Amino acid sequence: TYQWIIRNW
Amino acid sequence: GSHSMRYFSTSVSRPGRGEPRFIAVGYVDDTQFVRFDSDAASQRMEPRAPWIEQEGPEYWDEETGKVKAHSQTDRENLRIALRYYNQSEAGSHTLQMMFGCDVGSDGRFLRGYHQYAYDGKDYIALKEDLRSWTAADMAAQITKRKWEAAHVAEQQRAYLEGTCVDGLRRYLENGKETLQRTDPPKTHMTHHPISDHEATLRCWALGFYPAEITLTWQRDGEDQTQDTELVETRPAGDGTFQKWAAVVVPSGEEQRYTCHVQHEGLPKPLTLRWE
Amino acid sequence: MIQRTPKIQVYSRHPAENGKSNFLNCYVSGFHPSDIEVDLLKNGERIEKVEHSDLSFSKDWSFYLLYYTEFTPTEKDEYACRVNHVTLSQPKIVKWDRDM
Ligand SMILES: [Ca+2]
Ligand code: NA
Ligand code: NA
Ligand code: NI
């Protein structure tokens, strides 16, 4: 179950 | 007993020659189950274990989407890091991500992970408390202040505790025949001369799962910490692992030496000798 | 920037059995960056199309890969793997021993 990887550096 | 779920992403920028390459793998303990590759023909989350093949069509759609969003996020993050580290567009760089959760024998939450890395070194990492971050350098601090102001960790905590553990739980029950089934090592001994005054004793271990094994050597009754060559646990090709421990013994003194094998597949740790 | 040298292990899936078909493995690990050239050899000649694992890393961000081919071991025929990386001065050829 993949996570919401959406936040930018 | 205790189990884990981990997702490993790798983004490698290609100077001028198109889009950066994104590869994402999913593991349950030491067994891989899902794959994504930006160069692969499907452009979908592909199954790599038979116990996940049973999952629904909208599961694959949701998983493909999430991993597709990630590929975009890290390709943007690769551009952000060129500004942060004031680097040339002509250089190829690596952006790795690891996230996942640990569960106890009971099936309840134990630990959560969410960390990044730029060019082999750590960048940012979520602390054990799942409330604050760890910035490895000045550039990573810009990201720390951004994510602390936006309260990102709260959404991270929400996944790790819950969405992640329920996922791992489901994956364990659906694949108990392979993931929970432990295979003990198929041990064997060998002897090589090397010289007229010394001799080498190799203690082999093959076809075992999980990868965690503890091969120790003994002169008389006590453990030989040093003088013991240990190769790193290597994969066989199938779901099993291989490892060996060697020791250089004085010629004729082979009787004094015994090998102590430790694996959860064994009902009691083995003690072997060369014959 | 950071660059890590690969650790090469050349071996077999099942223990050495002449005449019976097996799998030859060249396991590269602890390397950085991901760009690596790995080829398997039959008497010093590159084996045609060798399948490899999906790129993954360890708890230190170092990479690991497993290159493999369906081969038939015999007393006649030598097997070795050629590994080339940025960290290497020249390609390393590691030979396969019956007792690795
Ligand atoms: Ca490739
Ligand atoms: Na681009
Ligand atoms: Na910090
Ligand atoms: Ni097989």
Author numbering:
A (entry chain C): 1 to 9
B (entry chain A): 1 to 275
C (entry chain B): 0 to 99
Which of the paper's sentences describe this entry?
Here, we define CD8+ T-cell immune landscapes against IAV and IBV, restricted by the mortality-associated HLA-A24 allomorph. Consistent with the HLA-A24 peptide-binding motif generated by NetMHC4.037,38 motif viewer, enrichment of Tyr/Phe at P2 and Phe/Leu/Ile at P9 were observed.
Instead, we identified a potential HLA-A24-restricted IAV/IBV cross-reactive candidate, the immunogenic IAV PB2549–557 TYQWIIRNW epitope. This epitope shares 55% amino acid identity with the cross-reactive IBV PB2550–558 variants. Indeed, virus-expansion with IAV/HKx31-infected C1R.A24 cells induced cognate IAV/PB2549–557+ (A/PB2549–557) CD8+ T-cell responses in 2/4 donors as well as cross-reactive responses to the IBV PB2550–558v1 (B/PB2550–558v1) variant and the B/PB2550–558v2 variant. We solved the structures of A/PB2549–557, the overlapping A/PB2549–559, and B/PB2550–558 peptides in complex with the HLA-A24 molecules at a resolution of 2.90, 2.95, and 2.16 Å, respectively with clear electron density for each peptide. Solvent exposed residues were at P4-Trp, P6-Ile, P7-Arg, and P8-Asn, representing a large surface accessible for TCR interaction. The P9-Trp of the peptide formed a network of interactions with HLA-A24 tyrosine residues at positions 116, 118, and 123 as well as the Leu95, likely assisting with stabilizing the complex reflected in the higher stability observed for the HLA-A24-A/PB2549–557 complex than with other peptides. Structural overlay of HLA-A24 presenting the A/PB2549–557 and B/PB2550–558 peptides showed that the antigen-binding cleft and both peptides adopted a similar conformation with an average root mean square deviation (r.m.s.d.) of 0.31 and 0.37 Å, respectively (for Cα atoms), consistent with T-cell cross-reactivity observed towards these two peptides. Structures of HLA-A24 with A/PB2549–557 and B/PB2550–558 showed that the antigen-binding cleft and both peptides adopted a similar conformation, providing a structural basis for T-cell cross-reactivity between these epitopes. However, only the A/PB2549–557 epitope showed immunogenicity in HLA-A24+ individuals, with the instability and bulged conformation of the longer A/PB2549–559 epitope potentially proving challenging for TCR recognition.
